[PDB]
Design a protein around this ligand. Structure first.
Ligand code: CLA
Ligand code: CLA
Ligand code: CLA
Ligand code: CLA
Ligand code: CLA
Ligand code: CLA
Ligand code: CLA
Ligand code: CLA
Ligand code: CLA
Ligand SMILES: CC1=C(/C=C/C(C)=C/C=C\C(C)=C\C=C\C=C(C)\C=C\C=C(C)\C=C\C2=C(C)CCCC2(C)C)C(C)(C)CCC1
Ligand code: SF4
Ligand SMILES: [Ca+2]
Lengths: 165, 733, 74, 80, 39, 144, 37, 126
């Protein structure tokens, strides 16, 4: 398909790698009993390996000449060939959680900056205020867009210190 | 008392310590800091130094030619340039034992010699050199040119020959003559040599000074050139069965644009290179008539700079006053020249490995690797120097009053934003590249290689498909048989170019995968971080919040003391200093990637690189540990071979690098106290106190210590990698 | 012979570590470079770029270098 | 010898003079501050450049500056 | 008790508890959903 | 107040000697001599290393550099509340009084002192190095 | 012809390696320590 | 002031040092150089003879060792000459050895004595 790759469900190297992993696990299992802890652990690892290979092939991932899955980062190719779950959806997921953390921290700093000793609140975290801001940070994109549109997101150039050039 | 050395610094001559000699040696070329120096004298000294540098360059070239003609095997290498190793020069060392003598005796010589890795054999063979007499004549000619340049340097310092300050500032005349004469006429002359000598010599016809006036480069003899029938010079080119150096399969054309590579030499066609030089010669000559000098027509660079300001005021004053701040500042010109030369050096390295211009160059793996690594390291050092001189310009020549509101002042106006964004880009690239590497390493360690993150470089593969590569299957532009871009070049250059780019046995647009993506991001991280350090040091050179008056202390000063929290490595010199390490790391990553990809290509197993370049353990084991086995076995308890010199150089570089770490970690104070104890010991020792020193022994200064440590670090770095690369590539092939 | 050489290597490394630690202990209060080092304390960065440079003159810095030499020796 | 300069932002706190380890600075009468004193550097030939005076200065920015100049036996603090 | 809660509200204790919670959440997610590579 | 004169026949503190004393510089270039008055015999620390005993009355000592003399002066003033003074002696026999130069310690203002190296401007008012370029030698904008 | 003799390295290598650097180092050492009038 | 110990204050070591040619203070510098050169060349010929690269080949080990010692003596003589030229440029009793002419004569005497000592050490092994 994309970049001359082949789907993992049809790649021979993919199935060969799965057989190799199951073969080394079975070889290690051949030295133990049939109802012992190492045997059960090795069988669980084998089942996890089989489930992982079947799940990766079911997801529609593309495998190269090495039999390993390859990710598609281009939004056009990912949305046109059903690869948005690799790099697109996790991108927006990270953006949401990262902006969540940044917005909560910024709100906490702005909240404690108007007190008597903000540094004291910076070393000794005010748990009730932090918990309230952490719960209220779910609407961080809407609140951030509103702050940017009102002009309260940035600080004026005259209020920021600079070097003597 | 006052010493004679150094004559240019009275303050250093009065120094009674050993620091006088070191500082006199390190401040000899800083003419701006000399005593009683004027602008006119400054330009005159630089003129003389330029002539001396050209003399040294030409003498070095003549030396290489002379040694290849005397102790080399050029006459035998031209007969079989595939199975014969080139010889650099002979070896005469009384320390060699008998096994070392027969070990280095190779290449058909009668004694111990060195196998050259510079590629001058292929270059001289392609341009037309065939016998040792030609190299001897070229060596004598270059020695005469070197002597003439040295005499010119001495002559331009005597009275009635020293140029005035106004002559050195004629930017329009200098630019016109450099574009039309130094660039265009030189390229036209090179075209004349290729058409008259290189092309006929590649077809088995000897054309020398004794018969070039009676031998026609083309059978039609200048008639198509004057009648405008230039297409007659592209008729009947060299066929696919042409044997280089013989008339079998040779053609009659002198100016073609076939494209691709020669089927036997795997290099660019000589007719294509001649046509290339002719076209760029015409373009450069035409460009040499742009500025106004003495005939009314032309331009004034000040007018073009002053008439280039946006109307909305986005760039403030635009480029007003930029002509004076560039023409009156030598550091600005040096920085621009070094930036362009460094970029061009990198371009040379990339184009030279991908499109080999010299015959039988692609087969010489050691030559290709050494040339690429050499040019990339030279380019990195030159780039660091460009930024260092930019910082020197900000401290010594920048005038905020003259550059008021222009782009130059606006850069310093928002320098915090630039440094912060460079920091963010470097942080993102480092965090993600390192994270993906460690993730792949953990997946490979746990026995699950299918769980590692392998992002396909679809953008670069898309560009490769745009160039004609049909491996990925995008089928667009040159990759599609029904495109306008494809059909418009099918009769001129696309057949050869497509045949060469679709061949997986050359270095023309190599196949890339996730490993290439990851290492490219590592390269991006290195470039951005080195740029961040250099740019931050140049912008903060005039001052910062910690040191508001940094410009009053010069470009290089030790520090500002332990006050205000501590000010170690606060000068711009220290910023360049820290950036050299990042430059070495970046060039190390690019050369490691180049060498590993080419080693797997030449060995016939590209899958090894494709499967081991995604994790750092593969880089350490399959590339560094695996390829150093023959290197460390150059000399062992059972004997030695010709590869023992590279093993010794490997350990030599390791020792120099480690010695540099001493000047890098331990600082002055400890050494000064130790030296004081040594002074007492010498003064209280009989039979030895009768011999006294002339200079008081003192520890090296902070700045000198940094420079010495960096010099050892760089020397060890370069020597270690050069020995490893040459030994691994030569031993494997 | 190899054992003899490595034993002399060990003796040399131990002697250098002893030299750095002993120099940091004996010259902790004063020296010919800084006569009032004891007033600056035990752990201080330097005494400025004066006198050619007085970087790493404190006894703490001697311990800092002795750690590297101990690592090399061991 | 090093170059030691005093600026008009000096408040006459005499902290730089007390911190000088080679007696380079001193106090002279002045009228530009409340303390009616100003720092001075009449013995710069004995300055080593330790910059202790800059560390002891409380004004922002500093009122005393030391620029490392030519090096001699006294400036290098050599007892030999 | 007020002083003890204030001590627990300090930066190292809060960082330790928060990182233990985040690490435990990620570990439990990877335990109930083994080997997640794509969405 | 008048400038004092060095008395070479002055008793020195009880010290057994050390290896951190004078060197060839004292015999070929110059050396320094510090003198002070002690109210009683007391053990003090030598700037060159070791413990010496200052005697009751006059005390004279020799050092290789001025920093050692000032360090001893600071120690005697801050601990024993004494008033020491030193000179620079040349091999020819010339003696030059050094501190306190005007008889009064420099930390306290004294009349008659003429200000030196004083700039009647602030640091931010210093000119750019380009205006100082092409001078007689390496000159900083603060020197003008 | 410009071809040097067979004994040329046996004379030029020791020269450039020991005679010329000794002379250069001695002359440079005398020049560095020369006192101005 | 300074530290006095029996090692640096014993009369036996003081007499031994005063008996050495360098501390004679009253003889010609060329004679001092000849004596020092002979005493140095005789001991210098040993290491090159017994440890050089040609120490195992017979009838030439002594030849190569003596030639190497002679070359070292020549290098040391050049070092003495440049030291005298760079040390004495301007300006009990003053020793004439610490002068331009005195040190030049001392270096020449050292060269003659060193070569004679090397030649004597070579024939002493035959
Ligand atoms: C971060 C940089 C970046 C880069 C280097 C690329 C690179 C690429 N994108 Mg892309 N893209 C990006 C960001 C980027 N994108 C972002 C942020 C978005 C979200 C808005 C998109 C959304 C997007 C779409 C919807 C498509 C691409 C497509 C492409 C590919 C060809 C088009 C092109 O080069 O023009 C740059 C890309 C754009 C200007 C976006 C618009 C698409 C243009 C108009 C081309 C589409 C026409 C047609 C589909 C071309 C293919 C013809 C045929 C082979 C089918 C190319 C490799 C095309 C593709 O190959 O589909 C598989 C495609 O249709 N991208
Ligand atoms: C309130 C927290 C906070 C926020 C909103 C930001 C925001 C920002 N930082 Mg920053 N930073 C932080 C904390 C924070 N930082 C801390 C604690 C450090 C010290 C490690 C740094 C060190 C740092 C550097 C060196 C740089 C930035 C940069 C930046 C900018 C680029 C985006 C980025 O993520 O860079 C990356 C930021 C990091 C890698 C550090 C993030 C640390 C965590 C995730 C923040 C959590 C803070 C706190 C524990 C949570 C609040 C608790 C409260 C509710 C009680 C951006 C505006 C870049 C810049 O200069 O702008 C262009 C840059 O170069 N930051
Ligand atoms: C047509 C007239 C002419 C010509 C030929 C030159 C030529 C030259 N001038 Mg000059 N100049 C001229 C007119 C001219 N000038 C006039 C009218 C003025 C007064 C306004 C000046 C004022 C002037 C000054 C002040 C200086 C020079 C200097 C130089 C030298 C530059 C050295 C150099 O970079 O190497 C040659 C550069 C090239 C050949 C161009 C290289 C092209 C790129 C960078 C490389 C690519 C080529 C190819 C890929 C690589 C080859 C591959 C293989 C062979 C290895 C050069 C020889 C400098 C000097 O004095 O040196 C002594 C200098 O300081 N000139
Ligand atoms: C066209 C190229 C060019 C030119 C003309 C200059 C010119 C100048 N530079 Mg510059 N520079 C350049 C490129 C250039 N540079 C590059 C490529 C770099 C990056 C490496 C630098 C980085 C740089 C810095 C940081 C500084 C200068 C400075 C200077 C100025 C005077 C210093 C000097 O040269 O004294 C003499 C130079 C030396 C004595 C160099 C020391 C020897 C070096 C370390 C080589 C050691 C190699 C070693 C011996 C190899 C042995 C190996 C073997 C034995 C095994 C001078 C105007 C200085 C300045 O402006 O003063 C404020 C300044 O500090 N340069
Ligand atoms: C392997 C050695 C090494 C490493 C990792 C770095 C890393 C870095 N350098 Mg650096 N540098 C080095 C050697 C190194 N340098 C040397 C030898 C020199 C010459 C002295 C320099 C000189 C230098 C300069 C001058 C500058 C940098 C800068 C930077 C930062 C660039 C931003 C980035 O890439 O983000 C990625 C971040 C990393 C790679 C750090 C690693 C993150 C770790 C592994 C994650 C944390 C681990 C885990 C979660 C917690 C473990 C803690 C444990 C105790 C519990 C980065 C942190 C630049 C900078 O500051 O940018 C703003 C800067 O200007 N370097
Ligand atoms: C491999 C790198 C390296 C090397 C070679 C050295 C070497 C040395 N260190 Mg050092 N050190 C290093 C790394 C290194 N260090 C680092 C990274 C640090 C930072 C932690 C330190 C910190 C440090 C401290 C704190 C001290 C030293 C000291 C010393 C000296 C010990 C005396 C000695 O060993 O006698 C002999 C010298 C050697 C064995 C070095 C190699 C000499 C070769 C084998 C001889 C070659 C001669 C050859 C003929 C020359 C001809 C050249 C030709 C062109 C003419 C010595 C010169 C100590 C000292 O001052 O000395 C008492 C000291 O206190 N080092
Ligand atoms: C920035 C670099 C980076 C990136 C992008 C990844 C990415 C990934 N790693 Mg990895 N890793 C890294 C660095 C990185 N790692 C490093 C440095 C190490 C060494 C410590 C590891 C060691 C490591 C191991 C051992 C494993 C992974 C695994 C994974 C995958 C797990 C996805 C997941 O957690 O489920 C989903 C997570 C969530 C749904 C949490 C969502 C957050 C909230 C609850 C929801 C909000 C969303 C709206 C994922 C694709 C696992 C794997 O299976 O690999 C395929 C695994 O076994 N990593
Ligand atoms: C810069 C170019 C260059 C270089 C790097 C070398 C390097 C070498 N030459 Mg060679 N040589 C050169 C130019 C060069 N040569 C030229 C142009 C000639 C023709 C006159 C010769 C003639 C020559 C002979 C006959 C021999 C060598 C030999 C050698 C090797 C032994 C070392 C030596 O220096 O011998 C001595 C080299 C010379 C006497 C030639 C120097 C003559 C030029 C004109 C003077 C150069 C001055 C220099 C640039 C100033 C800087 C030096 C210093 C002050 C910083 C060595 C590999 C010997 C050999 O082959 O060993 C196996 C040997 O027998 N060379
Ligand atoms: C770059 C030039 C250079 C040259 C040409 C030589 C040449 C030589 N070296 Mg040497 N060496 C050099 C650099 C050089 N070295 C450097 C830089 C180092 C430090 C790393 C050394 C360290 C070194 C050692 C440790 C030894 C040598 C030895 C030797 C000799 C080999 C012994 C032999 O097998 O022959 C046979 C030897 C003879 C027939 C005796 C000849 C005696 C001399 C050479 C002739 C008379 C001296 C001459 C008249 C005066 C010259 C002084 C001149 C500078 C003014 C040989 C003549 C060995 C040696 O000296 O042999 C004992 C040896 O032990 N070298
Ligand atoms: C600091 C400083 C400075 C600066 C420096 C610098 C600036 C550096 C850098 C840098 C660099 C180094 C740059 C470069 C660049 C480049 C560019 C900008 C480019 C480009 C491109 C293009 C445009 C292309 C296009 C194309 C393509 C894409 C391909 C095909 C072909 C074509 C053409 C189409 C100086 C000294 C001045 C002075 C002041 C200070
Ligand atoms: S420390 Fe600063 S403010 Fe105080 S007297 Fe000295 S120069 Fe003036
Ligand atoms: Ca010919």
């Amino acid at each position: 398909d994309i970049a001359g790759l082949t789907p993992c469900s049809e790649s021979k190297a993919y199935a060969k790698l799965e057989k190799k992993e199951l073969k080394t696990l079975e070889k290690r299992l051949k030295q133990y009993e049939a109802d012992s802890a190492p045997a059960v652990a090795l069988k669980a690892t084998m089942e996890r390996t089989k489930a992982r290979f079947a799940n990766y092939a079911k997801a529609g991932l593309l495998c190269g000449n090495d039999g390993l899955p390859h990710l598609i980062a281009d939004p056009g190719l990912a949305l046109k060939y059903g690869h948005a779950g690799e790099v697109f959806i996790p991108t927006f997921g990270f953006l949401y959680v990262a902006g969540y953390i940044g917005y909560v921290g910024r709100q906490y700093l702005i909240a404690v900056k108007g007190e008597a000793k903000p540094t004291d609140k910076e070393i000794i975290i005010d748990v009730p205020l932090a918990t309230k801001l952490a719960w209220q940070g779910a609407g961080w994109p809407l609140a951030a867009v509103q702050e940017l549109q009102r002009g309260t997101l940035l600080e004026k150039e005259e209020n920021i210190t600079v070097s003597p050039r | 008392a006052t010493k004679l050395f150094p004559k240019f610094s009275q303050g250093l001559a009065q120094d009674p310590t050993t620091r006088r000699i070191w500082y006199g040696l390190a401040m000899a070329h800083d003419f701006e800091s000399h005593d009683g120096m004027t602008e006119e004298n400054l330009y005159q000294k630089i003129f003389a130094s330029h002539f001396g540098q050209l003399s040294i360059i030409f003498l070095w070239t003549s030396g290489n030619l002379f040694h290849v003609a005397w102790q080399g095997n050029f006459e035998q290498w031209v007969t079989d340039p595939v199975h014969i190793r080139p010889i650099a020069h002979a070896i005469w060392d009384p320390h060699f034992g008998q096994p070392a003598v027969e070990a280095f005796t190779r290449g058909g010589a009668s004694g111990p010699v060195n196998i050259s890795t510079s590629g001058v054999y292929q270059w001289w063979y392609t341009i037309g050199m065939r016998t040792n007499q030609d190299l001897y004549v070229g060596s004598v000619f270059l020695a005469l040119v070197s002597a003439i340049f040295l005499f010119a340097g001495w002559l331009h310092l005597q009275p009635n020959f020293q140029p005035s300050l106004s002559w050195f500032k004629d930017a329009e005349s200098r630019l016109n003559h450099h574009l039309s004469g130094l660039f265009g006429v030189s390229s036209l002359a090179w075209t004349g040599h290729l058409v008259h000598v290189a092309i006929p010599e590649s077809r088995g016809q000897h054309v020398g000074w004794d018969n070039f006036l009676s031998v026609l480069p083309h059978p039609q003899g200048l008639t198509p050139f004057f009648t405008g029938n230039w297409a007659a010079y592209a008729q009947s080119p060299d066929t696919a069965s042409h044997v280089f150096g013989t008339a079998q399969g040779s053609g009659q054309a002198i100016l073609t644009f076939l494209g691709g590579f020669h089927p036997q030499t795997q290099s660019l066609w000589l007719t294509d290179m001649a046509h290339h030089h002719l076209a760029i010669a015409v373009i450069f000559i035409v460009a040499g008539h742009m500025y106004r000098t003495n005939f009314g027509i032309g331009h004034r660079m000040q007018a073009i700079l002053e008439a280039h300001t946006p109307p909305s005021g986005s760039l403030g004053a635009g480029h007003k006053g930029l002509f004076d701040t560039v023409n009156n500042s030598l550091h600005f010109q040096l920085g621009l020249a070094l930036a362009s030369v460094g970029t061009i050096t990198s371009l040379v390295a990339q184009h030279m490995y991908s499109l080999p211009p010299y015959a039988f160059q692609a087969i010489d793996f050691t030559t290709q690797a050494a040339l690429y690594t050499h040019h990339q390291y030279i380019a990195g050092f030159i780039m660091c120097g460009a930024f260092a001189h930019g910082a020197i310009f900000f401290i010594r020549d920048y005038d905020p009053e003259q550059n008021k509101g222009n782009v130059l002042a606006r850069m310093l106006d928002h320098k915090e934003a630039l440094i912060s964004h460079l920091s963010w880009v470097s942080l993102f690239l480092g965090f993600h590249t390192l994270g993906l590497y460690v993730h792949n390493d953990v997946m490979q360690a746990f026995g699950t290689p299918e769980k590692q993150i392998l992002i396909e470089p679809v953008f670069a593969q898309w560009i490769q498909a745009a160039h004609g590569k049909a491996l990925y299957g995008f089928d667009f532009l040159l990759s599609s048989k029904t495109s306008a871009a494809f059909a418009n070049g099918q009769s001129l250059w696309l057949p050869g170019w497509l045949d060469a780019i679709n061949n997986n046995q050359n270095s023309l647009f190599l196949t890339i995968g996730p490993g290439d993506f990851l290492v490219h991001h590592a390269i991006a991280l290195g470039l951005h971080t080195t740029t961040l350090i250099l740019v931050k040091g140049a912008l903060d050179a005039r001052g910062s919040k910690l040191m508001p008056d940094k410009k009053d202390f010069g470009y290089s000063f030790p520090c500002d003391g332990p006050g205000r929290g501590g000010t170690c490595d606060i000068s711009a010199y220290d910023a360049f200093y820290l950036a050299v390490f990042w430059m070495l790391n970046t060039i190390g990553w690019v050369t490691f990637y180049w060498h590993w990809k080419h080693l797997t290509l030449w060995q016939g197993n590209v899958a090894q690189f494709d499967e081991s370049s995604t994790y750092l353990m593969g880089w350490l084991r399959d590339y560094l540990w695996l390829n150093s086995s023959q290197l460390i076995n150059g000399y062992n308890p059972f004997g030695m071979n010709s590869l023992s010199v590279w093993a010794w150089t490997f350990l030599f570089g390791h020792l120099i690098y480690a010695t540099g770490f001493m000047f890098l970690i331990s600082w002055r104070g400890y050494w000064q106290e130790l030296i004081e104890t040594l002074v007492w010991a010498h003064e209280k020792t009989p039979l030895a106190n009768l011999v006294y020193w002339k200079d008081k022994p003192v520890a090296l200064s902070i700045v000198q210590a940094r420079l010495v440590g960096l010099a050892h670090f760089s020397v060890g770095y370069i020597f270690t990698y050069a020995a490893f690369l040459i030994a691994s590539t030569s031993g494997r092939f | 012979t190899s054992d003899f050489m490595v034993h002399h290597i060990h003796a040399f490394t131990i002697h250098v570590t002893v030299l750095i630690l002993l120099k940091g202990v004996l010259f902790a209060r004063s020296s010919r470079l800084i006569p009032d080092k004891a007033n600056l304390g035990f752990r201080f960065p330097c005494d400025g770029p004066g006198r050619g440079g007085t970087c790493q003159v404190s006894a703490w810095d001697h311990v800092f270098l002795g750690l590297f030499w101990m690592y090399n020796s061991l | 010898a090093h170059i030691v300069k005093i600026y008009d932002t000096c408040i006459g706190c005499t902290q730089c003079v007390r911190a000088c380890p080679l007696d380079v600075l001193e106090m002279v009468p002045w009228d530009g501050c409340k303390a009616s004193q100003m720092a001075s550097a009449p013995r710069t030939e004995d300055c080593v450049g330790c910059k202790r005076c800059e560390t002891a200065c409380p004004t922002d920015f500093l009122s005393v500056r030391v620029y490392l100049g030519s090096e001699s036996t006294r400036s290098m603090g050599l007892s030999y | 008790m007020k002083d003890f809660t204030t001590y627990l509200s300090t930066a190292p204790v809060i960082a330790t508890i928060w990182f233990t919670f985040t690490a435990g959440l990620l570990i439990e997610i990877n335990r109930y959903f083994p080997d997640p590579l794509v969405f | 107040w008048t400038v004092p004169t060095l008395n070479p026949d002055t008793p020195s503190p009880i010290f057994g000697g050390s290896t951190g004393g004078l060197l060839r510089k004292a015999q070929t270039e110059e050396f320094y001599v510090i003198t002070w008055e002690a109210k009683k015999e007391q053990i003090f620390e030598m700037p060159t290393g070791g413990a010496a005993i200052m005697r009751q009355g006059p005390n004279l000592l020799k050092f290789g550099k001025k920093e050692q003399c000032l360090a001893l002066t600071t120690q005697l003033r801050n601990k024993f509340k004494l008033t020491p003074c030193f000179y620079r002696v040349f091999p020819d026999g010339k003696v030059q009084y050094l501190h306190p130069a005007d008889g009064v310690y420099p930390e306290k203002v004294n009349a008659g002192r003429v200000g030196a190296n004083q700039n009647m401007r602030r640091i931010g008012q210093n000119v750019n190095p380009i205006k100082v370029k092409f001078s007689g030698r390496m000159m900083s904008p603060a020197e003008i | 012809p410009f071809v040097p003799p067979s004994w040329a390295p046996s004379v030029f290598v020791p020269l450039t390696g020991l005679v010329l650097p000794a002379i250069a180092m001695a002359t440079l050492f005398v020049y560095i320590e020369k006192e101005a009038p | 002031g300074m530290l006095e110990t029996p090692v640096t204050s014993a009369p036996i070591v003081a007499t031994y040092l005063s008996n050495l040619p360098a501390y004679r203070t009253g003889v010609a510098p060329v004679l001092r150089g000849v004596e020092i050169g002979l005493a140095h060349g005789f001991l210098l010929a040993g290491p090159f003879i017994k440890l050089g690269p040609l120490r195992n080949v017979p009838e030439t080990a002594e030849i190569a060792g003596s030639l190497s010692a002679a070359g070292l003596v020549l290098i040391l003589a050049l070092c003495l000459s440049i030291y005298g030229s760079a040390q004495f440029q301007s300006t009990v009793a003053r020793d004439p050895l610490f002068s331009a002419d005195g040190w030049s004569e001392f270096a020449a005497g050292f060269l003659v004595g060193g070569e004679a000592g090397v030649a004597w050490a070579y024939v002493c092994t035959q």
